[PDB]
């Protein structure tokens, strides 16, 4: 009736190297049996698993409001720049894997 995929914000996150970099992932779950995954695109335009919630430099924390999660790169390096998304693997109702639209992390020289 009003549906949204998992939100991954911001679409462009620009930090200096050594800074922490924190994306926000939003997923409105209609059940409790799901896991939330954080991914980075391989150069093959494919998908590698960085971290999940429930579960070292990539961490996912679940915020109090039951919707939002924080995926943070600790002390971002310059080879951290690339494509990122989150995805919501929910088994019921209807067993779906829902991926956010991609976001760019851009780590600029210090």
């Amino acid at each position, epitope marked *: *009736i009003q*549906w949204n995929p998992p939100t991954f914000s911001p679409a462009l996150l620009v930090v200096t190297e050594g800074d922490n970099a924190t994306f926000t992932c939003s997923f*409105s779950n*209609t*059940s409790e*049996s*799901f*896991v939330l995954n954080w991914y980075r695109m391989s150069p093959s335009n494919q998908t590698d698993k960085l971290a999940a919630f429930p579960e070292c430099r990539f961490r996912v924390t679940q915020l109090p409001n039951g919707r939002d999660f924080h995926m943070s790169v600790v002390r971002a390096r310059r080879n951290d720049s690339g494509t990122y998304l989150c995805g919501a*693997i929910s*088994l*019921a*109702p*209807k*067993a*779906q*894997i829902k991926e956010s639209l991609r976001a760019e992390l851009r780590v600029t020289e210090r």
Partner: antibody, heavy 113, light 113 residues
Framework: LQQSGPELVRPGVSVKISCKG?????LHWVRQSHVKSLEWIGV????????NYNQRFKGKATMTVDKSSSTAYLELARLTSEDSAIYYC?????????????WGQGTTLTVSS | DIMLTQSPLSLPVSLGDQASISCRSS???????????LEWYLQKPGQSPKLLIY???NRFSGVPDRFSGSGSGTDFILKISRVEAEDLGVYYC?????????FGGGTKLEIKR
């Protein structure tokens, strides 16, 4: 899609039936009683073991998966003459729009003294 | 819980007549997706149920063109135009939009004579 053979056990004991296919689906258990009324028991994820149970069958049913063997288990505990039924396993693909394509043959379970 | 009540239990027909089985739910079955995951299954005696119609109207491939699913809101209809030796059995609707998933009570399609 190949389940354990038929079982005849006494009230109060437990039984474990098996369903053998793997990491691409959700696996469901559906029980069909002797009035031919189907009921959904639960779903298990082969690759995470995460579960969702019909609350009515929580505690009467426990779902477990072994991925090396590519086999799922339903354990029925504290058994009673109501659990006499045909127990089917069936699967559902992840990102498709339909549920049960292929079924197991079913495992007929009788509980009596 | 979504209880699915079907009418009638027995539908007598001549092979080639027009019979329609109806499925009614106690509340709306629209999933978070906007999709309505309602299905129709046909069960021949001694075998697993087989998927015929998924979503509301989609026929699964392999399924004959005469089985037409439709419906909306709280109301759904399975219609069979050409009714066959291979069509007799018990038809169940099913909703997969809200856990727990639930089946209708069944409708037995029989030969009138």
């Amino acid at each position: 899609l190949q389940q354990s053979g038929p079982e005849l056990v006494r009230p109060g004991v437990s039984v474990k039936i098996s369903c053998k296919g793997f990491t691409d689906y959700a696996l469901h258990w559906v029980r069909q009683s002797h009035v031919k009324s189907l009921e959904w028991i639960g779903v298990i994820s082969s690759y995470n073991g995460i579960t969702n149970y019909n609350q009515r069958f929580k505690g009467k049913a426990t779902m477990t998966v072994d991925k090396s063997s590519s086999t799922a288990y339903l354990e029925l505990a504290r058994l009673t003459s109501e659990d006499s039924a045909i127990y089917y396993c069936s699967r559902e693909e992840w990102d498709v729009f339909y549920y049960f394509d292929y079924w197991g043959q079913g495992t007929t379970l009788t509980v009596s003294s | 819980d979504i209880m699915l009540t079907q009418s009638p239990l027995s539908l007598p027909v001549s092979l080639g007549d027009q019979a329609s089985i109806s499925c009614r739910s106690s509340q709306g079955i629209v999933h978070s997706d906007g999709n309505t995951y309602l299905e129709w299954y046909l069960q021949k005696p001694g075998q697993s149920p087989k998927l015929l119609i998924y979503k509301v109207s989609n026929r699964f491939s392999g399924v004959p063109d005469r089985f037409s699913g439709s419906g909306s809101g709280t109301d759904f209809i399975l219609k069979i135009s050409r009714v066959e030796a291979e069509d007799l059995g018990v038809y169940y609707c099913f909703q997969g939009s809200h856990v727990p998933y639930t089946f209708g009570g069944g409708t037995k399609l029989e030969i009138k004579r």
